[PDB]
Ligand binder design. Sequence first.
Ligand code: CL
Length: 71
Amino acid sequence: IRCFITPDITSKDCPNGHVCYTKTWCDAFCSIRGKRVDLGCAATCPTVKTGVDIQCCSTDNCNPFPTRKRP
Ligand SMILES: [Cl-]
């Protein structure tokens, strides 16, 4: 599967991966710089601790980097 990967934010081939993932959470700068985003690929949808969100998908490049919409 092909997925976007942080910190390059480029699409990479994960020949042995099955899903892409988007992990987001707030650090101390979340108000001014938005959530931190970790994009990657995995054989299965990884697990995240409390306060961290993860959305997994199973098609090439289905985890585009989500920027914050600027009002
Ligand atoms: Cl985590």
